[PDB]
Amino acid sequence: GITARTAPAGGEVRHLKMYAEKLADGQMGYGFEKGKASVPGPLIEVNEGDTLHIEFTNTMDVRASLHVHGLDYEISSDGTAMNKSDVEPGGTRTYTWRTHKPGRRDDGTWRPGSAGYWHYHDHVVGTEHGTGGIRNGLYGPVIVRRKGDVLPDATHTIVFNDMTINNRKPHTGPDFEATVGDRVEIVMITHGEYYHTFHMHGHRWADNRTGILTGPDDPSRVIDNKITGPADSFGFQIIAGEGVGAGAWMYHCHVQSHSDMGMVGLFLVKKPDGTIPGY
Amino acid sequence: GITARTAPAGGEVRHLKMYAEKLADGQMGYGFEKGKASVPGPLIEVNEGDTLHIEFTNTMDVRASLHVHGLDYEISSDGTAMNKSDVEPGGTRTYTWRTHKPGRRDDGTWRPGSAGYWHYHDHVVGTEHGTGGIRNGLYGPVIVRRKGDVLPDATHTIVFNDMTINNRKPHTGPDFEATVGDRVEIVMITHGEYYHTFHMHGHRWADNRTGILTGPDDPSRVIDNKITGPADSFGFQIIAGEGVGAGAWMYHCHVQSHSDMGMVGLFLVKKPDGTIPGY
Amino acid sequence: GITARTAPAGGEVRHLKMYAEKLADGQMGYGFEKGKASVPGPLIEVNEGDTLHIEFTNTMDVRASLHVHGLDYEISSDGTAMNKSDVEPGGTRTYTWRTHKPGRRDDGTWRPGSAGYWHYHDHVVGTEHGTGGIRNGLYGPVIVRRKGDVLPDATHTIVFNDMTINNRKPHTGPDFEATVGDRVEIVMITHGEYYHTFHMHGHRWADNRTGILTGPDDPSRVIDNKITGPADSFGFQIIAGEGVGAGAWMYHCHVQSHSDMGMVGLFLVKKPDGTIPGY
Ligand SMILES: [Cl-]
Ligand SMILES: [Cl-]
Ligand SMILES: [Cl-]
Ligand SMILES: [Cu+2]
Ligand SMILES: [Cu+2]
Ligand SMILES: [Cu+2]
Ligand SMILES: [Cu+2]
Ligand SMILES: [Cu+2]
Ligand SMILES: [Cu+2]
Ligand SMILES: [Cu+2]
Ligand SMILES: [Cu+2]
Ligand SMILES: [Cu+2]
Ligand SMILES: [Cu+2]
Ligand SMILES: [Cu+2]
Ligand SMILES: [Cu+2]
Ligand code: NA
Ligand code: NA
Ligand code: NA
């Protein structure tokens, strides 16, 4: 980053409301507002050092919770039945998530920071591991930025949940749109029973923390295909159409029967006039 | 590299013919020449910056195509039905693949290069994801070298395709031979329905782009076992017999029922007299 | 490491006895002493450069062997039937494992060292790939330290073997205990038929060789969840309770039906008084 926007230093205390609700079709979703729950749940993005107090309200008729990966939380914000941190029907509970910068410990070793592509989901609906909650749609992305991380034009969330993308019916996307040159960020999460392989036509990224190479010294494999299993999360940024131009670029699971059965979407990269060649 | 051979700078325009054909036993393969199709298809190796024009002819009675991972291609060389870039029976089409070196963008960020271990396969036989084509043998390796990359004595391709290695019958290899000290390159690709774990006796490599460490600063895990799923590709170089001597060194999938059912081969490392201890 | 303990330079010749024995319940385990076999087998830890002569005795009524990952061994210590290096019932055989430091080769390239998290297991019980042996419990961890590697307070071994952790009945752990601040090392190995995803509540590590970052330049993804398949091994160190405090922190496979069916344990992090909040 030299003219691209980059993340500032963190350290703010932030407050926020979340709700779990039952949707009309039988699914379950999180939202920042009652009546506006989505699957996947809304993106939460913070900077290393930020603290997040989430006033969580369960509007459903069964117990539910909020469990996060990667971020610092005390055992009281575990989101599990065992540690008494789930939420009764109609109830409200404040979960606290903290994040930290990396740095030297007293023993001379290097403490990793919280930065990365993470996620949150339910841990008590259906089973004490949230199997029913997760299947129904109680999951969502969390991004933690390091000071200096490159910021994108837009962020899209792709979740392989059992045999669905984002709980959608087979062969219904989702599709995403960009213009040639856009800096597009993808957050890729997997849930459920199955392993998958995420693949994008026409684009590639680094298999490291940020999905991008800092410079010529980073030996990370550059890839366009990645095996994932339940609760894996990673993310990356690509320049839409870079070196390849506009087009209807497929992304899909590359497990042959999964793509055949509907785990396919389109990354629609447009020319400025909005047209897509071959579409 | 200081006395080992290394890749030169790229930037040549290269031309090439390929064919897809039906084989007598019902399989399908690619070749550089009619009558000389193989499974896996022939290796394509280029240097970062090279352009490749492939005059592709489909000699089969069903539509077929050429789809590549990792390399730059415009949407017209997608190799998909949707983007009208497959090929009618008897037809001919010119696919263009480009590659680029890494470098700084105008925004100050670092663009990754095309270098890596990649692959090509069919995308329209049987299904619009090439399920039948891939099952029948329409796949092959592509290597893109960075300026300065270490070159091997020989390159072998190992493809785990469903429950087969290189579409072979159970317990029929393939086997590869080397002499103690040879620099051997492996390109490892997976296709089909199943996850696998690739394992080599007596040898190990780095889990990064090239499979080798540049020096003492590379923190990449050194491994001898790697989980893979459909359309994953990686590669590496080993010094045959280094620190372990000659021998019939097994490689196999480490999923227990897969090795039991025939996903096993031999890396035959010979003494100069050509003998193998214990073989 | 500056006040933390670190590994010394290696290069010692070490001797050791091992036994394979049948256990009263029908399982099979390795031990350093007859009558003290365990599943997992005892940890073997050496420094880069060490040589290890293992006088192995098979006390069982069927042929058995010792096969190691990662370490240097000549073909006579392969532990396979093919290379005549298994052991008859009642027999004794000396296996030799060597290890080496990294360094420059004559050709100018960088030879990787043996350092890493590895493992050993049987290769001839039940099948010529040790399927019965492995299922019955013939597996164990091996750690090879690089000069300067940070040493932990304690090392725990977690093995996902088919649908079990360490061959235990569903929902019986194992559990591990630590005090807030302890440097805890985990060695994580997978065996059998299935892919898994290892997950720890409240803690995270680097996806590289040592599981820790050297400093600010290491671009490795920091994770709390990792997909694994048969014969994969990795390890890492965490500071128990760092930034999160005491508590009954779950670890489990994150494949939903696996956690539901019993692949769960507890990392019990205590305050100095020995108490755990919420437990
Ligand atoms: Cl989205
Ligand atoms: Cl080959
Ligand atoms: Cl243990
Ligand atoms: Cu959990
Ligand atoms: Cu899939
Ligand atoms: Cu593709
Ligand atoms: Cu989770
Ligand atoms: Cu595709
Ligand atoms: Cu396999
Ligand atoms: Cu082995
Ligand atoms: Cu593909
Ligand atoms: Cu083996
Ligand atoms: Cu599992
Ligand atoms: Cu968790
Ligand atoms: Cu093994
Ligand atoms: Na934000
Ligand atoms: Na070439
Ligand atoms: Na020791």
Domains present along chain B, CATH in parentheses: 1-149 (2.60.40.420), 150-279 (2.60.40.420)
- Rounded to the nearest angstrom, the distance between the alpha carbon of A156 and the centre of ligand 1 is 4
Cα–Cα distance for residue pair C181/C269, rounded to 1 Å: 9
Instruction: Give residue A273 CA to ligand 1 midpoint distance, Å.
Output: 24
Please tell me which of the candidates C116, C206, C213 has its beta carbon nearest to residue B222. Answer: C116
**Cα–Cα distance measured from residue B191 to residue B196, given in angstroms and rounded to the nearest whole number:** 10
Distance of CA A117 from the midpoint of ligand 16 (Å): 14
Report whether C175 contacts C206 (CB < 8 A).
no
| Residues in chain A within 8 Å Cβ distance of B207 | 221
Asked if A32 and A43 touch (Cβ cutoff 8 Å), the reply is: no
Q: How many Cα neighbours within 13 Å face the side chain of A230? A: 24
Q: Collapse the DSSP code of B256 into the 3-class scheme (helix H, G, I; strand E, B; otherwise coil) and give the result.
A: helix
Torsion of CA C33, C35, C36, C42, to 10 degrees: 60
For residue A108, which amino acid is it?
A: G
Task: Give the ligand whose atoms come closest to the C-alpha of residue C42.
Answer: 3
Task: Collapse the DSSP code of B175 into the 3-class scheme (helix H, G, I; strand E, B; otherwise coil) and give the result.
Answer: strand
Q: Is the Cβ pair C205, A113 closer than 8 Å?
A: no
Locate C77 and state its tokens.
Answer: 């210590």
Give the end-to-end CA distance of chain C in Å, rounded to a whole number. Answer: 34
CA–CA gap between residue A136 and residue B103 (Å, rounded): 44
| Residue of C213, C223, C159, C220 whose CA lies nearest to C186 | C159
State how far the Cα of C21 lies from the Cα of A142, in Å rounded to an integer: 49
**B129-153 burial, b if ≥16 CB within 10 A, otherwise e?**
bbbbbbbbbbbbbbbbbbeebbbbe
Quote the ligand 15 centre to C172 CA distance (angstroms): 26
Between the CA atoms of C9, C12, C15 and C20, what dihedral angle is there, to the nearest 10 degrees?
A: 30
- Please state whether the peptide bond connecting residue C219 to the residue before it is cis, i.e. omega within 30 degrees of 0: no
Count CB neighbours of A41 within 10 A: 28
Indicate yes or no: CB of A1 within 8 angstroms of CB of B109: yes
**Nearest residue in A to C205, CA atom:** A112
3-state secondary structure chain A: CCCCCECCCCCCEEEEEEEEEECCCCCEEEECCCCCCECCCCCEEEECCCEEEEEEEECCCCCECCEECCCECCHHHCCCCCCCCCECCCCEEEEEEECCCCEECCCCCEECCCCEEEEEECCCCCCCCCHHHHHHCCEEEEEEECCCCECCCEEEEEEEECCEECCCCCCCCCEEEEECCCEEEEEEEEECCCCEEEEECCCCEECCCCCCCCCCCCCCCEECEEEECCCCEEEEEEECCCCCCCEEEEEEECCHHHHHCCCEEEEEEECCCCCCCCC
Place of tokens 């725990």: C156
Q: Is C260 helix (H, G, I), strand (E, B) or coil?
A: helix
C-alpha closest to that of C45 among C150, C116, C93: C116
Other beta carbons less than 10 A from residue C81's beta carbon: 16
Contact C208 B202 (CB under 8 A): no
Rounded to whole angstroms, the Cα distance separating B123 from B114 reads 21
User: Do C224 and A70 touch, CB atoms closer than 8 A?
Assistant: yes
Q: Which of C246, C254, C260 sits opposite A127 (nearest CB)?
A: C260
Residue B94: name the closest of B37, B14, B27 by CA. Answer: B14
- Say if the Cβ atoms of A106 and C245 lie within 8 Å: no
Q: Which residue has the tokens 């084989």?
A: B23
Which residue from A minimizes the CA distance to C266? Answer: A82
Helical (H) or strand (E) element with C248: strand C247-253
Torsion angle (degrees, nearest 10) of CA B160, B162, B165, B167: -130
Give the bridge partners for A67, in sequence order: A121
Alpha helical stretches, state H, C223-274: 256-260
Which one of the ligands is nearest to C196 CA? 13
In the A/B pair of chains, how many CB contacts fall below 8 A? 134
B113 vs C191: CA distance, rounded Å: 36
Q: How far apart are CA A111 and CA A100, in angstroms?
A: 9
Sheet hosting strand C116-121, strand order edge to edge: C44-47, C139-145, C116-121, C67-68
Instruction: Please give the residue of chain C at the shortest CA–CA distance from A115.
Output: C222
Provide the edge-to-edge strand list for the sheet that holds C247-253: C175-179, C264-270, C247-253, C196-200, C225-228
Around Cβ C101, how many Cβ atoms within 10 Å? 17
In whole angstroms, give the CA distance from residue C260 to residue C276: 24
Of the candidates B2, B242, B260, which has its C-beta nearest C108's C-beta?
B2
Sheet holding B247-253, edge to edge: B175-179, B264-270, B247-253, B196-200, B225-228
Point out the residue among A108, A134, A208 whose CB comes nearest to the CB of C4: A108
Backbone angles phi, psi at B153, to 5 degrees: -75, -40
Say if residues B230 and A256 touch (Cβ distance below 8 Å): yes
By the 8 A CB rule, do C234 and C226 touch?
Answer: yes
Give the contacts of C265 (CB within 8 A, at least 6 positions apart): C158, C165, C173, C174, C175, C176, C250, C251, C252
Nearest CA in chain A to B194: A255
A219/B209 touch (CB, cutoff 8 Å), yes or no: yes
Q: How far is the CA of A173 from the centre of ligand 18 (A)?
A: 54
C-beta of residue C239 within 8 angstroms of C-beta of residue C182: yes
Token pair of A120 as six digits = 């949150």
User: What separation in angstroms does the CA of C168 have from each of C77, C158, C162, C264?
Assistant: 30, 11, 11, 11
Residues belonging to chain A: 279
B226 vs A contacts (CB less than 8 Å): none
Torsion angle of C-alpha atoms B26, B31, B34, B38, degrees rounded to 10? -40
Nearest-CA residue of chain A relative to C4?
A107
Q: Which residues of B touch A199 (CB under 8 A)?
A: 69, 231
* Residue A153, number of CB atoms within 10 A of its CB: 15
CB contact under 8 A, B222 and C193: no
